[PDB]
Design a protein around this ligand. Structure first.
Ligand code: MG
Ligand code: MG
Ligand code: MG
Ligand code: MG
Ligand code: MG
Ligand code: MG
Ligand code: MG
Ligand code: MG
Ligand code: MG
Ligand code: MG
Ligand code: MG
Ligand code: MG
Ligand code: MG
Ligand code: MG
Ligand code: MG
Ligand code: MG
Ligand code: MG
Ligand code: MG
Ligand code: MG
Ligand code: MG
Ligand code: MG
Ligand code: MG
Ligand code: MG
Ligand code: MG
Ligand code: MG
Ligand code: MG
Ligand code: MG
Ligand code: MG
Ligand code: MG
Ligand code: MG
Ligand code: MG
Ligand code: ZN
Lengths: 211, 156, 224
RNA sequence: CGGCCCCCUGGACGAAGACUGACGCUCAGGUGCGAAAGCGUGGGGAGCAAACAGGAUUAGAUACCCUGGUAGUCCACGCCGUAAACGAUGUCGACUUGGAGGUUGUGCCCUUGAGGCGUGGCUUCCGGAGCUAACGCGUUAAGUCGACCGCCUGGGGAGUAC
RNA sequence: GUAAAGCGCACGCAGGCGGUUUGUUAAGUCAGAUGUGAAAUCCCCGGGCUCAACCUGGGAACUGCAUCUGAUACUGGCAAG
């Protein structure tokens, strides 16, 4: 049975959008293409900086990109230089004055994207998958997550019959829209093909709507 | 200071409607090396969970045996189901002459010089139960002296 | 309690001669009208010697669990426990109440969380139907663990009414080494009771006599 | 071992005594008994029924089903000596918590039939400790012991060959 | 009992076993002694080949057998119950 995307089904209930600008029907597709290119460039140039999220706002005639990362120093660079270096090329890509803000993820083991990309990086450095799975789940449960499910799928260990192995610890209620579940995916490109990792992290139900 | 020891790990199975489900069972022993010994048996879906389950069970029901300078008090027989163990005190430096399942139990229990032998089935669970039952029935000169109403000197 | 004090309450009464247990022969005075008669000559000293032990346990800060699941005598046993600041089980006994202590602690925590949450607030944030459902769950948890929410750990002594009816409790206790004090009718098996009181376990008057005397001696043991 | 009756005859049990004074237990070889089928001789023969004869059914029926039907089943005297001949549990003795029945004796007491309190024999069913691989057995043990006998030693070959 | 394994059941000779008391006997049993149990080998303490293997001194052992003198609880014999 297929499952709805747990992030998209909670949009406007407990989860916010990653793009929060307004546009009519004539500059909408242009904006989507622009910030898709922006996100692509930023994920390519910051694959080592442990970037979790890229929020993008568009004020009147500007663009503001907030980078939610776990290693702010690496993103900024010494003397506050690399941030400006990527800010000017983001302004080139978007064709509009750009701003770059940086928000630190104080607990990386509670972010779904960071856990997933860590698992995939361990996978393509040929670490045994169950080890990384268990370590991620236990690290998340130790730092106060009320539940986590980690699922790795596709030709594990370099076999010839692909299989899917998941592991849950705690309470992860997916049918509760009120629940605040961070969900992300990632892909590891091993010499035997691509392997898909999915992470759900439950952080407690939120009472009172988006506020 | 409670030395633990994994004795055996078995891969049991059970066929639910669709297919087979494999579980792991762990037989382990723990002991303080000074006359307190217990065994545990755990089942789980994965091996380390089963082993740790057995570890907690082993700590519970830790019986006390009456040792005599690191060896038994007298030759003793312990029988559980098919398994039938014979244990017998030995001199210093003899070592633990016993089979595997008996070796683990005796080494964690705190004996160092015994001569053992297992007749009948050598199934680790039953052998462990047999040797623990044999160690439990061991008497001491003071125990038997108080039991019979004599003094320890009036018996030896 | 004096033999006259028991006899007026009817402590000597027992089950039918058709329904008795073999080990109870020493404690049985005889039979009348096909009814087993319990001997107060054994009942009184054993109850006194049990009261001595209960006073001792309570005088070393003991936690006492009064146990009885009779639909008639549930409130009597509950009030008996309240009169001496102790813990009780008046609703049907749950298997693993003592042996599965960890699971009870989670249930105790959930009952505490719901009552604390209602005082703290956020029931307004919950939907009106949800808030009512949470109150119903809190009531169900209280009907289940009203007596042992504040027991904290495993009790130091057990008082049991109709030990045959509550046989799971005594099996657990013996498995834990927790002493059992029990009113044992002729139909019961007395092996599980370390301080056995042979007496009627149904009659409201004699049950209340047992409970009141025990509670008076427990308060006395507490007072020092 | 099954109607009833007579005649001849074996064993078991109970009550109270009297008598004998270890005369006992087990038993290789040996002897006897030993369902049914079968064999020999003669008799009998209603029903039943291997074989067989038909009628059907069926791919096939040399089976199941149907109509007949001989040996046999019955009796007498011999032979055969085998069965899942089973409680799949050798015989004898002692000891070890209970409960509910059946059957057959018997003692004593109550107003007595009725009823109550005992005490034996045999027998059926639950179940405790203990035992057992488990199922289960559990005072009629598969429990705790003793005496003697029979028997077992991977499956097949084979209970076959000689 | 069901894994291989209780004769289909009985009677019964040889055989194995045998309640209880006293006396006796001394066969079994037990104790001591004497004779014998070859040497080598095995084992213990030593000695000799530079060490070891090896050689070798003394002992222990050779668990046995026969005989003599005792013991008499038990088993057997005999006698009386
Ligand atoms: Mg769908
Ligand atoms: Mg074997
Ligand atoms: Mg005479
Ligand atoms: Mg014969
Ligand atoms: Mg015939
Ligand atoms: Mg013929
Ligand atoms: Mg004929
Ligand atoms: Mg003829
Ligand atoms: Mg016919
Ligand atoms: Mg035969
Ligand atoms: Mg028959
Ligand atoms: Mg047979
Ligand atoms: Mg018998
Ligand atoms: Mg009969
Ligand atoms: Mg039974
Ligand atoms: Mg027997
Ligand atoms: Mg058997
Ligand atoms: Mg063969
Ligand atoms: Mg033949
Ligand atoms: Mg067989
Ligand atoms: Mg037989
Ligand atoms: Mg005979
Ligand atoms: Mg004879
Ligand atoms: Mg004799
Ligand atoms: Mg003789
Ligand atoms: Mg001699
Ligand atoms: Mg010699
Ligand atoms: Mg030398
Ligand atoms: Mg020499
Ligand atoms: Mg010599
Ligand atoms: Mg004699
Ligand atoms: Zn009652």
């Amino acid at each position: 049975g297929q499952k709805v995307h747990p992030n998209g089904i909670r949009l406007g209930i407990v989860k916010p959008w990653n793009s929060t600008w307004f546009a009519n029907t004539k500059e909408f597709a242009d904006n989507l293409d622009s910030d898709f290119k922006v996100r692509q460039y930023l994920t390519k140039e910051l694959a080592k900086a442990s970037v979790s999220r890229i929020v993008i706002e568009r004020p009147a005639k500007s663009i503001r990109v907030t980078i939610h990362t776990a290693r702010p120093g690496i993103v900024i660079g010494k003397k506050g230089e690399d941030v400006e270096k990527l800010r000017k090329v983001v302004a080139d890509i978007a064709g509009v004055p750009a701003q770059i803000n940086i928000a630190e993820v104080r607990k990386p083991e509670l972010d779904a994207k960071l856990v997933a990309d860590s698992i995939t990086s361990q996978l393509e450095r040929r670490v045994m998958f169950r080890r990384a799975m268990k370590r991620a789940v236990q690290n998340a449960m130790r730092l106060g997550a009320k539940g986590i499910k980690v699922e790795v799928s596709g030709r594990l260990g370099g076999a010839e019959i692909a299989r899917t192995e998941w592991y849950r610890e705690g309470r992860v209620p997916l049918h509760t829209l009120r629940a605040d579940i961070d969900y992300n995916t990632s892909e590891a490109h091993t010499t035997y093909g691509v392997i898909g990792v999915k992470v759900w992290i439950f952080k407690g139900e939120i009472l009172g709507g988006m506020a | 200071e409670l030395q633990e020891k994994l004795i055996a790990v078995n891969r049991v199975s059970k066929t639910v409607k669709g297919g087979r489900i494999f579980s792991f069972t762990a037989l382990t022993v723990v002991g303080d090396g000074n006359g307190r010994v217990g065994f545990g048996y755990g089942k789980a879906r994965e091996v380390p969970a089963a082993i740790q389950k057995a570890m907690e069970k082993a700590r519970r029901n830790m019986i006390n045996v009456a040792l005599n300078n690191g060896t038994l008090q007298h030759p003793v027989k312990g029988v559980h189901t098919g398994s039938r163990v014979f244990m017998q005190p030995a001199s210093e430096g003899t070592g633990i002459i016993a089979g595997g399942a008996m070796r683990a139990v005796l080494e964690v229990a705190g004996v160092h010089n015994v001569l053992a032998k297992a007749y009948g089935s050598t199934n680790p669970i039953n052998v462990v139960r047999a040797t623990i039952d044999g160690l439990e029935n061991m008497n001491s000169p003071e125990m038997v002296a108080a039991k019979r109403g004599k003094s320890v000197e009036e018996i030896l | 309690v004096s033999m006259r004090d028991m006899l007026k309450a009817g402590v000597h009464f027992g089950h039918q001669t058709r329904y008795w247990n073999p080990k109870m022969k020493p404690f049985i005075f005889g039979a009348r009208n096909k009814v087993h008669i319990i001997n107060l000559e054994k009942t009184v000293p054993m109850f006194n010697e049990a009261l001595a032990e209960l006073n001792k346990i309570a005088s070393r800060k003991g936690k006492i669990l009064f146990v009885g699941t009779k639909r008639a005598a549930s409130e009597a046993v509950k009030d008996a426990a309240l009169s001496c600041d102790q813990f009780f089980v008046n609703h049907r006994w749950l298997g693993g109440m003592l042996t599965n202590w960890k699971t009870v602690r989670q249930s105790i925590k959930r009952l505490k969380d719901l009552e604390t949450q209602s005082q703290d607030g956020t029931f307004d944030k919950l939907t009106k139907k949800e808030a009512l459902m949470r109150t119903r769950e809190l009531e169900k948890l209280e009907n289940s663990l009203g007596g042992i929410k504040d027991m904290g750990g495993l009790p130091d002594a057990l008082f049991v009414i109709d030990a045959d009816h509550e046989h799971i409790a005594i099996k657990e206790a013996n498995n834990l080494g927790i002493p059992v004090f029990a009113i044992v009718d002729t139909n019961s098996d007395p092996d599980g009771v370390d301080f056995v009181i042979p007496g009627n376990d149904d009659a409201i008057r004699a049950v209340t006599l047992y409970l009141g005397a025990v509670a008076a001696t427990v308060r006395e043991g507490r007072s020092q």
